[PDB]
Design a protein around this ligand. Structure first.
Ligand code: MNR
Ligand code: K
Length: 405
């Protein structure tokens, strides 16, 4: 339903886009969001859906708003408002200056030196899962690889048992793509219910896992509190369970549909890192936002204190103002412009882990199963929300074209 139009919003700016179920979803999720960049649509629109909020539809505005934390605060970063109010993860619910101290700690557990440490296990897991699928000539890519690969890596890093995956994956999905069985607040409280005892145990008897490190950590030279450690670990769970998992499916759907692009990477594997970046642009998948701290005139539009603004990280890279022919995938694209890992002071801390996972997947998949397709007759369905995804991805191939390594 449509929330009543606030007095301060002019009617010519109304465009009733539903971030949780966009009109054009069947064309693909990125395509559905790109409707916001059609020629009739203003740079900044108001939607009456999901309680009413602004949407910045172009890279220039999205980047500018992410840079200006004084006007656009992270305190309430999710739509709808109830979700944004309940949201208290660290560092993503905080603005600078307070935010900054927590980034170093998060970097300790998911940043580059740690990725380098885990590089062998990452490689070994990808190779193992792919080799197991290889002789079958088919898989359901979402459950058979997209989920277990990044998630088992995360559970290893976090020292959490793999038997907990179904529960934690259900909870994380309710925060980004709710099926309506749980409010954001209920899902967050259930995640915290899971974490509270584990954090307590690991502050008492620290191990070497990520939860132990965060829970016994210091922030700018003082001890982290139990509460802070909880709000940081909650964020890490969501990052581990509902980002790379979805992106891998978008990428492998594309490669399955594009023999020419697979061939390019098979023949030119040095281009895989560049291909990763271009896929990250084309199949960008996150959309959160900010809350106005004061009345503010932004690009000729009067924003009111307390108004929410969706700043879709997804849209910057799809904006033809940033990238010529933005819906075309070009691994040789000269300046790949995107905000897929965010922009400003909250730039993704997991991005090195994500890239390693993506690049390892592409290299190890294409080495063993170079030639694959969507199952004949299958219709791939996307899903939209704070993080967008792929419902299911049935792939097929001829085992005779495969290679065991
Ligand atoms: C397990 C760890 C993580 C993984 C894997 C991961 C993977 C990915 C990923 C995969 C393709 C994409 C796309 C992605 C996208 C983002 N990510 Mn990431 N992410 N991500 C974090 C951990 C992780 N991410 C953390 C922690 C922050 C918060 C930094 C801060 O607020 O100061 C963050 C922040 C962000 C933001 C900024 C949100 C904002 O400004 O409100 C975006 C966008
Ligand atoms: K909040």
């Amino acid at each position: 339903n449509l929330a009543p139009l606030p007095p301060h919003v002019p009617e010519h700016l109304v465009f009733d886009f539903d971030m949780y179920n966009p009109s054009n979803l069947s064309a693909g999720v990125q395509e559905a969001w790109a409707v916001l960049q059609e020629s009739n649509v203003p740079d900044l629109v108001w939607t009456r859906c999901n309680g009413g909020h602004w949407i910045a539809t172009r890279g220039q505005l999205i980047r500018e708003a992410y840079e200006d934390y004084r006007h656009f605060s992270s305190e309430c970063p999710f739509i709808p408002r109830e979700a944004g109010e309940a949201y208290d993860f660290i560092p993503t619910s905080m603005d600078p200056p307070e935010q900054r101290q927590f980034r170093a700690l998060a970097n300790q557990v998911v940043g580059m030196p740690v990725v380098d440490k885990l590089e062998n296990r990452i490689q070994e897991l990808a190779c193992s899962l792919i080799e197991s699928l290889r002789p079958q000539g088919q898989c359901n890519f979402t459950e058979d690889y997209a989920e277990p690969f990044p998630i088992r890596i995360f559970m290893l890093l976090a020292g959490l048992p793999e038997e907990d995956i179904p529960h934690l994956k259900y909870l994380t999905d309710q925060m980004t793509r709710p099926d309506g069985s749980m409010t954001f607040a209920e899902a967050k409280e259930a995640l915290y219910d899971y974490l509270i005892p584990i954090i307590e145990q690991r502050r008492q008897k620290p191990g070497t896992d990520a939860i132990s490190i965060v829970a016994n950590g210091q922030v700018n030279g003082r001890p982290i509190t139990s509460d802070e450690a909880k709000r940081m670990c909650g964020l890490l769970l969501v990052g581990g369970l509902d980002t790379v998992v979805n992106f891998l499916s978008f990428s492998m759907e594309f490669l399955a549909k594009s023999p020419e692009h697979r061939q390019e990477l098979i023949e030119r594997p040095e281009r895989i890192p560049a291909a990763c970046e271009e896929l990250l642009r084309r199949f960008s998948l996150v959309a959160d936002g900010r809350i106005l701290t004061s009345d503010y005139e932004f690009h000729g539009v009067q924003l009111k204190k307390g108004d929410q603004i969706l700043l879709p990280q997804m849209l910057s890279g799809l904006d033809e103002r940033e990238n010529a022919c933005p819906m075309h995938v070009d691994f040789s694209r000269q300046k790949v412009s995107h905000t897929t890992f965010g922009h400003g002071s909250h730039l993704c801390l997991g991005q090195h882990l994500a890239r390693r996972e993506i690049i390892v997947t592409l290299k190890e998949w294409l080495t063993r199963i170079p030639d694959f397709s969507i199952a004949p007759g299958a219709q791939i369905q996307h899903k939209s929300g704070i993080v967008s995804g792929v419902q299911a991805l049935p792939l097929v191939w001829d085992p005779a074209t495969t290679k065991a390594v």
